Chain A
Amino acid sequence: KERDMDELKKEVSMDDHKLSLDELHRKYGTDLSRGLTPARAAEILARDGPNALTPPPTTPEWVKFCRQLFGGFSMLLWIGAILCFLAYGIQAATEEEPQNDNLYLGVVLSAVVIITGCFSYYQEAKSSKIMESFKNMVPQQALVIRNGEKMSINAEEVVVGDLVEVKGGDRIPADLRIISANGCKVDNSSLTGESEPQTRSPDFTNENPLETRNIAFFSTNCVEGTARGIVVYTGDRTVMGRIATLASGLEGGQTPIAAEIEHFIHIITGVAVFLGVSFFILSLILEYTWLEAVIFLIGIIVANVPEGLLATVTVCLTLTAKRMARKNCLVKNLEAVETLGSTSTICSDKTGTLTQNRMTVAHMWSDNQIHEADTTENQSGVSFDKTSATWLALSRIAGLCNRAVFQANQENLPILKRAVAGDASESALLKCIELCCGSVKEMRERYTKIVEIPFNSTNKYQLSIHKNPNTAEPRHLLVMKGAPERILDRCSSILIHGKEQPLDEELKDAFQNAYLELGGLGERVLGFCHLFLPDEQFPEGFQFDTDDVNFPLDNLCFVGLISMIDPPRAAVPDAVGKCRSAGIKVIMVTGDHPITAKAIAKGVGIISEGNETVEDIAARLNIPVSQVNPRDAKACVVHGSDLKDMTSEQLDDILKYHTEIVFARTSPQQKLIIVEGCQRQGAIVAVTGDGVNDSPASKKADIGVAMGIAGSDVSKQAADMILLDDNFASIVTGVEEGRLIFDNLKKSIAYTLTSNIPEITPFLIFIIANIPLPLGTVTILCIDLGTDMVPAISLAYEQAESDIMKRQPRNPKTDKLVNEQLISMAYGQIGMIQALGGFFTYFVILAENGFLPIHLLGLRVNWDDRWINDVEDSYGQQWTYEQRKIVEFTCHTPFFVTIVVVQWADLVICKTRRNSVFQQGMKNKILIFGLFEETALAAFLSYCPGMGVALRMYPLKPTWWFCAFPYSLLIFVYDEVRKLIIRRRPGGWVEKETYY
């Protein structure tokens, strides 16, 4: 009965914060100023569990090893090995001197699955081994007030209903209920997704427990100020606890690559049992008994199983995963490497993933003119004109009138990614001055501060006064900053290029429109002004104490507005554009304010410049918003408050009739519903996030991508891919590699599937025409697990035939990894020519040694006999047993060589699916080495001392090595003209029937 437990977690949380202080004191029974007694503390601590998320479900190493020993591809080889021991059981107990070929093969198939499990397991486990090196769990302490005394205990030693105090810089331990605030600003970024530092007030503000201000949250950090509260929720019953436990209990789904592998096995066994059954019935119709026919059935079906294709595909995926690890893109799953390419809808998180999740100085308003600043994390953009008097004024208004400085170790760290204490706004301003205006150390101490006036609770303004060390004027310098409404009410002078002017409305309205431009853009604007103090009314000894009116509040000189916002990450816009360039539907999913979400969406590409929403049209026509037709709005913003009152059909409609969607104010449990909505269409979903709100989303999606450093640990663990460097362009890299490895995979499949026809046809016509065995078992192993290993792996190294980032994403119902065209090529045409080429060399060796092909009919009866040492050929010669068996084995060896020779041309025609070998180019050095290794290995398996003994692969007369050349060249020419007709005729006969 765990279904009800998960269902009670998918629902949005409820609370009881909206209570009076006396009612709360009665419900929890705790002194609001002294707290509770330590006895009651330990009494609860040993009553419901310590304040800490219960550990994740430990995964023993033998479990995931056995996991790698199963699955889709491995299970096929398991039924094959079991069928080998079954056929061997039928062969041992029923006939004399049974041949050890079947058992010899069964153990090999088992070893194939086991070794593949060892390699793949060591790989997937290595990905988690480097993950255990990223958990830097520093046990932090909490400040709890108990028995009237403040004490710092461990966060796990905290109980329910106890007084807790926080200092600006501390992390909120458990979920509290704010009872006494003082300039408290917490960071609910990793949880609800609120970007700007949200303030916390003891009064009840909103019915929703998340948007309200009287609740402190788990894993949130106190940015500035102090606050008191009562611990309402502890342990897993917390907000982020109820989210983490939800992510740990959700389903993973089925990767698309796994579905393609399953369907591929379906076709493989579909034709395997078809040929095995039709030939079993045909064999019984001929002459063979049930005993023999069963062995034939098992042989035909098992032979149709690509034995080596398992490891070649596993390595094929591991190689592509290596390039992911090089670019700091870790994949915990060995198949999730491909999922980015088959993706068609990306649900990205705004704060932390799309944006830098850090307040930064956006624009300026110098000389009645907007000036955009560099808002990149690595500082690689256009710089504003920084050589004017208005700049030297404004920069000092920021470099002096600000309560923000650096810290101890902040000396070698970069200018932006360094720790700064104080307000987020003041930190951003300090950074922009420390970068675009020299330094602030000597620039701040050069002006000895006299008096300061901090921000007010009402009419927020921060002013101060400083001395003037300029060697041109010994007067004073008064500076002030504040909201753009506080500076407009206390100013009359205006600065321009160095001189002053009145507050003329012709330029004051020019200030108002510039305020609404930076305001409607989702940014927070600030005003900076200063005024000279006459040294004749306030000489260099008058200490204007902070009591009464000592400075001229009005007649100040305004320098310019300075807006700010959390900017998007560096390559995020270009990357989003690249995704849309391929056809990937980008949908922003965040729980922040729509005012900022829409602005950042416009600034990254999720909202195209020109497309309007249902509200934008109404605002453009001065008409009620409920009149316009939603079909006229290509894009739409969805307020999460409205999403609560929606059904499945409605969200389906939101995604069907709107191309650009922006979900705002969405709860963590709602992101799950959004992802499921995008999945109800039938498309592939990739959710990129960082905070804990993206944990259930990054878990239910087909693939979850978490940020490596700027993301929490819950969502990072519950994800399928991690961007260790937070470079969002790795998403574009991933989708490129996913489509690349998909097509290259098809090529490797067609390669290994082509060799099956010449591997099985000798045994088929062996039964029909009753000729001596043309191809042995060990030789087949030398082909599937020997020579063809390097070619198949080298085929994965092929590059793009055309621009893959241009074509639309693959359709899951139409574009399959193994379509019926591929089987018509490998099993149908190519492999058939290879089989004929092998039978050619067969008849060549036998006819040259005295057994003409016409005479080989019905000869296997006495040929396979061990004691008939007087078998007649076409010349009348009598061959013994070993003398004719030597010819049979030295006939298997050139058949093996023949397969290698035709596989040369097959590997080259498989290198290009649509292009020509001349167009593409033999630059795949892995493939070149594949051909040379394949050839030299085949030659070594024939001319080495003891091959005719260990493997019965006797040496070959040099004339045999050329019996396969015409068939190989034939295959090359036919497939080349096929790829040529597909080039000149993009119609579809040669395409829709063969082009796989």
Chain B
Amino acid sequence: KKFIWNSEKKEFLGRTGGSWFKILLFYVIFYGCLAGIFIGTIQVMLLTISEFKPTYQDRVAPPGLTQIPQSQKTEISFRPNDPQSYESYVVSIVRFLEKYKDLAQKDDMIFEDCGNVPSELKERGEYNNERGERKVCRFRLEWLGNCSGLNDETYGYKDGKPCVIIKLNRVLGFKPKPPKNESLETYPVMKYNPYVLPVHCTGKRDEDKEKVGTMEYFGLGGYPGFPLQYYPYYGKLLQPKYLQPLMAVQFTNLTMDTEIRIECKAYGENIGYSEKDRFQGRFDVKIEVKS
């Protein structure tokens, strides 16, 4: 019964030739109309959104806190001797900071020298297109002391006492608000509370906090945070080649050959947290410099 393939009375795979053509033509016209309808409705959907602002921005309410070595499990395990052991880290650090070199920020028509001291926020009008392409404040690698150097094509970083810079998730129209001067026990920090978003690292338990001996932070002018002069963001369309602020963190006194957990928590009023997303506001890392 399964040899209905053909017959002398014209049938192929079950039906005749003229029937195969009729069905194929119908399905082509039908699916063509379906495709045109889906495209037209998707076009109307495209007409309901703008180019300078996402309609819904509530799903990114608490900004994240990422790092340069995008580790497979947020763990930094390498050997202070073997150069190939830490190649995966250095490669990502150099590729990340490849857009922050002094040669990359050379055009004065799209770059603006903010300043050597963190100042107030810089609002460049509204988000419409009435104004031209906004300017982006420069951020030279020199701000991250002891984790930038004047190295060659390969940034000779720290083998012993590694460097891990942190970055605040770029959000459109987000205006960071540092905590009030009435700081509710925020782990010794400088008195530059009004024009910089503080970020403080620490261990996770009584063991990790003890293993991690000393940490040294580096930022704009020497403050452990992000300057307010670089916010808010005006989208990729209006501000291309934008450089969000960076802040490096070096762990000097670490216990070699021991995996220790570090939690870098960013503080502020407009900075939320989440018990489900360990990256919203805070940030975790598992460092282990095994010799």
Neighbouring A residues of B46 by C-beta, 8 Å: 847, 852
Is the interface on chain B under 10, 10 to 19, 20 to 34, or 35 or more residues? Answer: 35 or more
Which residue of B has the minimal Cβ distance to A887? Answer: B59
- The answer to whether A876 touches B170 (Cβ under 8 A) is yes
Q: Does B103 make an interface contact (CB < 8 A)?
A: no
Neighbouring A residues of B279 by C-beta, 8 Å: 869, 880-882
Contacts A869-B279, A875-B53 known; list 14 others, CB within 8 Å: A836-B37, A836-B38, A848-B54, A849-B54, A852-B49, A853-B42, A867-B72, A867-B73, A875-B172, A877-B233, A882-B279, A887-B59, A890-B59, A970-B37
- The answer to whether A847 touches B49 (Cβ under 8 A) is yes
Closest CB of chain B to A849's CB: distance in Å?
Answer: 5
Q: Does B277 make an interface contact (CB < 8 A)?
A: yes
**Assembly CA distance A797 to B277 (angstroms):** 49
- The answer to whether A876 touches B280 (Cβ under 8 A) is no
- Ordered nearest first, which 3 A-B pairs have the shortest CB separation? A876-B236, A882-B277, A850-B54
Which listed residue, B30, B37, B277, touches A880 by the CB 8 Å rule? B277
**Assembly CA distance A844 to B42 (angstroms):** 8
Q: Does B60 make an interface contact (CB < 8 A)?
A: yes
Q: Does B64 make an interface contact (CB < 8 A)?
A: yes
- The answer to whether B42 touches A879 (Cβ under 8 A) is no
Within 8 A of A (CB), among B35-71: 37-38, 41-42, 45-46, 48-49, 53-57, 59-60, 63-64, 66, 70-71
Which listed residue, A829, A869, A877, touches B30 by the CB 8 Å rule? A829
Q: Does A840 make an interface contact (CB < 8 A)?
A: yes
- The answer to whether B277 touches A877 (Cβ under 8 A) is no
Which listed residue, B37, B54, B167, B237, touches A877 by the CB 8 Å rule? B54
- The answer to whether B34 touches A836 (Cβ under 8 A) is yes
Neighbouring A residues of B42 by C-beta, 8 Å: 840, 843, 853
- The answer to whether B280 touches A840 (Cβ under 8 A) is no
A883-B277 contact, Cβ under 8 Å, with A878-B64, A993-B23: yes
Closest CB of chain B to A813's CB: distance in Å?
Answer: 10
Closest CB of chain A to B49's CB: distance in Å?
Answer: 6
Within 8 A of B (CB), among A966-993: 966, 970, 993
Q: Which of A832, A850, A872 has the most CB of B within 10 A?
A: A850
Q: Does A651 make an interface contact (CB < 8 A)?
A: no
Neighbouring B residues of A966 by C-beta, 8 Å: 41
Q: Does A833 make an interface contact (CB < 8 A)?
A: yes
Q: Mark B206-245, 1 if CB is under 8 A from A, else 0.
A: 0000000000000000000000000001011101001000
Which listed residue, A829, A876, A970, touches B235 by the CB 8 Å rule? A876
Which residue of A has the minimal Cβ distance to B46? Answer: A847
Q: Does A319 make an interface contact (CB < 8 A)?
A: no
Neighbouring B residues of A957 by C-beta, 8 Å: 56
26 A-B Cβ contacts within 8 A? A833-B34, A836-B37, A839-B38, A840-B38, A843-B45, A848-B48, A848-B54, A849-B59, A850-B57, A868-B70, A869-B64, A869-B279, A870-B169, A874-B236, A875-B236, A876-B170, A877-B54, A877-B169, A878-B170, A879-B60, A880-B64, A882-B274, A882-B276, A883-B277, A883-B280, A886-B59
**Assembly CA distance A873 to B169 (angstroms):** 12
**Assembly CA distance A140 to B7 (angstroms):** 68
Neighbouring B residues of A880 by C-beta, 8 Å: 64, 169, 277, 279-280
Neighbouring A residues of B167 by C-beta, 8 Å: 870
- The answer to whether B236 touches A867 (Cβ under 8 A) is no
Within 8 A of B (CB), among A818-856: 820, 828-829, 832-833, 836, 839-840, 843-844, 847-850, 852-853
**Assembly CA distance A877 to B232 (angstroms):** 12
Neighbouring A residues of B45 by C-beta, 8 Å: 840, 843-844, 847
- The answer to whether B280 touches A878 (Cβ under 8 A) is no
- The answer to whether A881 touches B34 (Cβ under 8 A) is no
- The answer to whether B64 touches A840 (Cβ under 8 A) is no
Is the interface on chain A under 10, 10 to 19, 20 to 34, or 35 or more residues? Answer: 35 or more
Neighbouring A residues of B48 by C-beta, 8 Å: 848
Q: Does B250 make an interface contact (CB < 8 A)?
A: no
Neighbouring B residues of A993 by C-beta, 8 Å: 23
**Assembly CA distance A538 to B34 (angstroms):** 109
Neighbouring A residues of B60 by C-beta, 8 Å: 877, 879, 883
**Assembly CA distance A957 to B54 (angstroms):** 15
Closest CB of chain A to B237's CB: distance in Å?
Answer: 8
Q: Does B31 make an interface contact (CB < 8 A)?
A: yes
- The answer to whether A869 touches B54 (Cβ under 8 A) is no
Within 8 A of A (CB), among B63-98: 63-64, 66, 70-74
- The answer to whether B172 touches A877 (Cβ under 8 A) is yes
A848-B49 contact, Cβ under 8 Å, with A832-B34, A877-B171, A877-B172: yes
Closest CB of chain A to B24's CB: distance in Å?
Answer: 12
- The answer to whether B54 touches A867 (Cβ under 8 A) is no
- The answer to whether A883 touches B236 (Cβ under 8 A) is no
Within 8 A of A (CB), among B126-167: 167
**Assembly CA distance A870 to B233 (angstroms):** 15
Closest CB of chain A to B168's CB: distance in Å?
Answer: 9
**Assembly CA distance A820 to B71 (angstroms):** 53
**Assembly CA distance A869 to B167 (angstroms):** 11
Which listed residue, A820, A844, A867, A870, touches B74 by the CB 8 Å rule? A867
Closest CB of chain B to A856's CB: distance in Å?
Answer: 12
**Assembly CA distance A872 to B172 (angstroms):** 12
- The answer to whether A876 touches B59 (Cβ under 8 A) is no
Closest CB of chain A to B66's CB: distance in Å?
Answer: 5
Neighbouring A residues of B169 by C-beta, 8 Å: 869-870, 877-880
**Assembly CA distance A966 to B66 (angstroms):** 42
**Assembly CA distance A972 to B80 (angstroms):** 69
A848-B59 contact, Cβ under 8 Å, with A853-B42, A867-B72, A869-B279: no
- The answer to whether A848 touches B56 (Cβ under 8 A) is yes
Neighbouring B residues of A847 by C-beta, 8 Å: 45-46, 49
**Assembly CA distance A878 to B236 (angstroms):** 11
- The answer to whether A870 touches B64 (Cβ under 8 A) is yes
**Assembly CA distance A876 to B42 (angstroms):** 22
A876-B242 contact, Cβ under 8 Å, with A867-B70, A870-B64: yes
Closest CB of chain A to B100's CB: distance in Å?
Answer: 16
Neighbouring A residues of B172 by C-beta, 8 Å: 875-877
- The answer to whether A883 touches B64 (Cβ under 8 A) is yes
- The answer to whether B41 touches A876 (Cβ under 8 A) is no
Closest CB of chain B to A563's CB: distance in Å?
Answer: 57
Closest CB of chain B to A182's CB: distance in Å?
Answer: 66
Which residue of A has the minimal Cβ distance to B280? Answer: A880
Closest CB of chain A to B172's CB: distance in Å?
Answer: 6
Which residue of A has the minimal Cβ distance to B168? Answer: A878
**Assembly CA distance A849 to B45 (angstroms):** 13
- The answer to whether A867 touches B64 (Cβ under 8 A) is no
Which residue of B has the minimal Cβ distance to A820? Answer: B14
Neighbouring A residues of B233 by C-beta, 8 Å: 876-877
**Assembly CA distance A847 to B23 (angstroms):** 36
**Assembly CA distance A666 to B73 (angstroms):** 85
Neighbouring B residues of A876 by C-beta, 8 Å: 170, 172, 233, 235-236, 239, 242
Within 8 A of B (CB), among A876-898: 876-883, 886-887, 890
Which residue of A has the minimal Cβ distance to B71? Answer: A867
Neighbouring A residues of B72 by C-beta, 8 Å: 867
Neighbouring A residues of B170 by C-beta, 8 Å: 876-878
Closest CB of chain B to A840's CB: distance in Å?
Answer: 6
**Assembly CA distance A993 to B53 (angstroms):** 49
Neighbouring A residues of B53 by C-beta, 8 Å: 875
**Assembly CA distance A531 to B134 (angstroms):** 134
Closest CB of chain A to B166's CB: distance in Å?
Answer: 11
Closest CB of chain B to A495's CB: distance in Å?
Answer: 74
Closest CB of chain B to A614's CB: distance in Å?
Answer: 39
Closest CB of chain B to A670's CB: distance in Å?
Answer: 33
**Assembly CA distance A875 to B56 (angstroms):** 12
Q: Which of A832, A867, A970 has the most CB of B within 10 A?
A: A867
Q: Which of B30, B45, B53, B71 has the most CB of A within 10 A?
A: B45
**Assembly CA distance A833 to B33 (angstroms):** 11
Which residue of A has the minimal Cβ distance to B58? Answer: A849
Closest CB of chain B to A141's CB: distance in Å?
Answer: 60
Closest CB of chain B to A21's CB: distance in Å?
Answer: 64
